[PDB]
Amino acid sequence: XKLLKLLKLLX
Amino acid sequence: XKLLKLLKLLX
Amino acid sequence: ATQGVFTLPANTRFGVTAFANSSGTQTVNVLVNNETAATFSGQSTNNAVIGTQVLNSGSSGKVQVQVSVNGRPSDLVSAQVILTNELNFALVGSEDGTDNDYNDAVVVINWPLG
Amino acid sequence: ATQGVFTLPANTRFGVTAFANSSGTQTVNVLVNNETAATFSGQSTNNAVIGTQVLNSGSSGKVQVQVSVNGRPSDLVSAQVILTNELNFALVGSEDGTDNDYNDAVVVINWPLG
Amino acid sequence: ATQGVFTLPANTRFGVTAFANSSGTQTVNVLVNNETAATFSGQSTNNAVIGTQVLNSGSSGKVQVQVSVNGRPSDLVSAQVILTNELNFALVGSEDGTDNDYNDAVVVINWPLG
Amino acid sequence: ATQGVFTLPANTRFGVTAFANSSGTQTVNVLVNNETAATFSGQSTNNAVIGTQVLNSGSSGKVQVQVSVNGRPSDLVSAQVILTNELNFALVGSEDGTDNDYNDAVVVINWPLG
Ligand SMILES: *C(=O)C[C@@H]1O[C@@H](C)[C@@H](O)[C@@H](O)[C@@H]1O
Ligand SMILES: *C(=O)C[C@@H]1O[C@@H](C)[C@@H](O)[C@@H](O)[C@@H]1O
Ligand SMILES: *C(=O)C[C@@H]1O[C@@H](C)[C@@H](O)[C@@H](O)[C@@H]1O
Ligand SMILES: [Ca+2]
Ligand SMILES: [Ca+2]
Ligand SMILES: [Ca+2]
Ligand SMILES: [Ca+2]
Ligand SMILES: [Ca+2]
Ligand SMILES: [Ca+2]
Ligand SMILES: [Ca+2]
Ligand SMILES: [Ca+2]
């Protein structure tokens, strides 16, 4: 949920 | 416990 | 292979308990003989208990655990372990995403009770 | 053989949850590297959760579960199961009497969390 | 707790296989319905198979594994694991000495066969 | 979930043994650190041992079991179980057809040895 989206706009 | 115990003798 | 399905002895009371470890809200459905017998929902990233209940395995003994996040089924992993030929655990992990920690909802079924 | 002792990964958070199924009040002690980290107490013949907590496995990762009833150590059975090489359960049953049901206190340790 | 005793489905063929990891010669006895059904005896420190056999669990389904070395019973550990609600393993470890590796004879029972 | 993959302790000897229960000839590949380390093949409907070998888990400890029949990968089920915090079993079942017995090739990995 919360986590992957934040790793998504990233690496 | 005493549940088993109560019928250790009653049984 | 099918996961989250367990044949308990018929007419046997069992405990089912679910824990959550995910940003997604977990929905855990417990089916007995293919009919919903309990549903737990909750959100935690700290292993909170989102439900615990005692159920009866009924005439068939068939118990199925389904886990979904907002209706999307998670990938399940499961096994049954029996200790000293008496104490039974039916264990479910589930993965709602990509990190493969399989803890997003953790479900433990135990029997016998009492 | 020794039962109720598990080597977790060092410095790792884990859940520990206890259920009771006995006329006797159950005292569940959780040791992290031989020091008491949590203690649960309660009485139920219906699988009530008598405690749930998140702990850290400490320097060694060694976690030990002890169960007693009015100070008398129960006999333990245990095993660890790993699903999909990721999800770990350390499982304990315990017997305080003569019926060999091993459910008098049932303890489930699970990791990883989060 | 009792170890090495398993209730299999009755009248069901099962495999039993023993491996040895000890300087002592291992004698593995497999009982069905309390009567000796197979005996394996061998020595290896390299996990050699000292016996494998197909048996039938009979009307009771009761299967018991005993391990001895030079006539001395070994200390046993065991559990049963079920995968996808179908594939069963009954597992035994045994210790004949003081190093607590519990591998001195390792016994695997598996069913169904065929 | 991924099945048939296990992280063993690194640089550790382990046993790997395959049994067959199928009309089809089973090919069991055992990879260590992603490279083939052993290949067993054989055919049995009576639980014959189609291979047994001792391998070293290498620097990574990563062990993977793959099963093929008819030029297609079998569906795998697996789990790891630890007894008395010492004796390890990594268990694999596989299904090459439509009956879901998951015994068509059964693979048992055990450690420690010696
Ligand atoms: C969404 O972020 C993914 C989701 O929640 C994370 C906090 C973590 O628990 C992950 O395992 C889970 O799949
Ligand atoms: C004493 O009664 C024995 C005790 O409590 C019973 C109700 C039952 O749970 C039994 O298993 C437990 O040892
Ligand atoms: C193909 O025949 C199916 C196959 O062989 C059978 C004898 C039985 O073992 C079945 O499980 C296996 O898939
Ligand atoms: Ca996840
Ligand atoms: Ca998670
Ligand atoms: Ca009891
Ligand atoms: Ca009880
Ligand atoms: Ca030994
Ligand atoms: Ca040994
Ligand atoms: Ca099959
Ligand atoms: Ca088969």
What token pair was written down for F10? 């690194």
> Which residues of F are annotated as part of the binding site for Ca(2+)?
21, 95-96, 99, 101, 103-104, 114
* Beta carbon of F21 within 6 Å of any ligand 3 atom: yes
Is ligand 2 within 6 A of the CB of residue D96?
yes
Please report which helix (H) or strand (E) contains residue E8, including its range: none
Q: List Cα–Cα distances, F45 to C82, E13, F48, in angstroms.
A: 27, 12, 8
Ligand 5 ion: nearby residues, β-carbon < 5 Å? C 21-22, 101, 103-104
Nearest-angstrom CA–CA distance, D23 and D44: 7
- Residue D55, Cβ neighbours under 10 Å: how many? 18
Q: How many residues does chain D have?
A: 114
> How many CA within 13 A on the CB side of residue C77?
28
How buried is residue C95: exposed, middle or buried, by Cβ count under 10 Å (0-12/13-18/19+)? buried
Resolution (A): 1.3
Cβ <8 Å between A1 and C99: no
Q: How far is the CA of C104 from the centre of ligand 1 (A)?
A: 7
SS (H, E, C) chain C: CCCCEEECCCCCEEEEEEEECCCCCEEEEEEECCEEEEEEEECCCCCEEEEEEEEECCCCCEEEEEEEECCEECEEEEEEEEECCCEEEEEEEEECCCCCCCECEEEEEEECCC
3-state secondary structure of F44: strand
- The residue ranges of every structural domain in chain E are 1-114
CA–CA separation, C89 and D108 (whole Å) = 10
Check if the beta carbon of residue C102 is closer than 8 Å to that of residue A9: no
Q: Is the CB of D71 under 6 A from ligand 1?
A: no
The DSSP string of D50-85 is EEEEEEE-TTT-EEEEEEEETTEEPEEEEEEEEETT
Q: What chains are in contact with F, requiring at least 3 Cβ pairs below 8 Å?
A: C, D, E
Q: Which residues contact E62 (CB under 8 A, 6 or more apart)?
A: E5, E6, E7, E8, E31, E32, E33, E34
Instruction: Produce one character per residue of E61-95: b if its CB has 16 or more CB atoms within 10 Å, e if not.
Output: bbbbbbbbbeeeebbbbbbbbbbbbbbbbbbbbbb
- Determine the distance separating the centroid of ligand 5 and the alpha carbon of D15, expressed in angstroms: 13
- Closest CB from D47, D102, D114 relative to C15: D47
| Contact in structure between F20 and F102 (CB atoms under 8 Å) | no
Please tell me which residue of chain B has the smallest CA distance to D96: B1
Structure tokens at F49: 């041992």
D34 φ/ψ sector (left φ>0, alpha ψ -120 to 50, else beta): left
* Interatomic CA distance for residues C28 and C15, integer angstroms: 14
Query: Which residues make beta-bridge pairs with E93?
Result: E77
Each residue of D100-110: b (16+ CB within 10 Å) or e?
ebbbbbbbbbb
Dihedral sign (CA C42, C45, C49, C55): positive
Residue D26 is encoded by which pair of tokens? 């159950």
- Asked if D23 has any chain B CB less than 8 Å from its own CB, the reply is yes
The count of other CB atoms within 10 Å of the CB of residue F102 is: 25
Rg (CA), chain B: 5
Compute φ and ψ for F51, nearest 5 degrees: -175, 150
Task: Count residue pairs from C and F with Cβ separation < 8 A.
Answer: 19
Picking from D51, F81, E90, the residue whose alpha carbon sits closest to that of residue C84 is E90
Count Cα neighbours of C59 within 13 Å in the Cβ-side half-sphere.
3
Q: Which two tokens stand for residue E81?
A: 């694991």
Say which CATH architecture domain D1-114 belongs to.
Sandwich (2.60)
Q: Is the CB of D45 under 6 A from ligand 2?
A: yes
**Cis check: omega of the bond before F112, within 30 degrees of 0:** yes
Pocket test for ligand 1, best of C47, C94, C104 (most atoms within 8 A of CB): C104
Q: Is B9 strand, coil or helix?
A: helix
- Among positive and negative, which fits the CA dihedral C108, C114, D1, D2? positive
The answer to whether E98 and E50 are in contact (CB under 8 A) is no
Of E45, E91, E110, which has the smallest distance from its Cβ to F19's Cβ? Answer: E110
- Write out the DSSP string of D5-59: EEEPPTT-EEEEEEEEEEEEEEEEEEEETTEEEEEEEEEEEEEEEEEEEEEE-TT
- State in Å: Cα D88 to ligand 1 middle: 17
Which residue type does C11 have? N
Amino acid at E27: T
**Residue F11 alpha carbon to ligand 9 centre in Å:** 18
Q: Nearest 10 degrees: CA dihedral of F12, F39, F20, F84?
A: 10
Q: Is the Cβ–Cβ distance between D109 and D19 less than 8 Å?
A: no
Q: Of all protein residues, whose CA lies closest to atom 6 belonging to ligand 1?
A: C22
Residues ≥6 apart with Cβ < 8 Å to E68? E27, E29, E74
Report CB contact under 8 Å: E91, F78: no
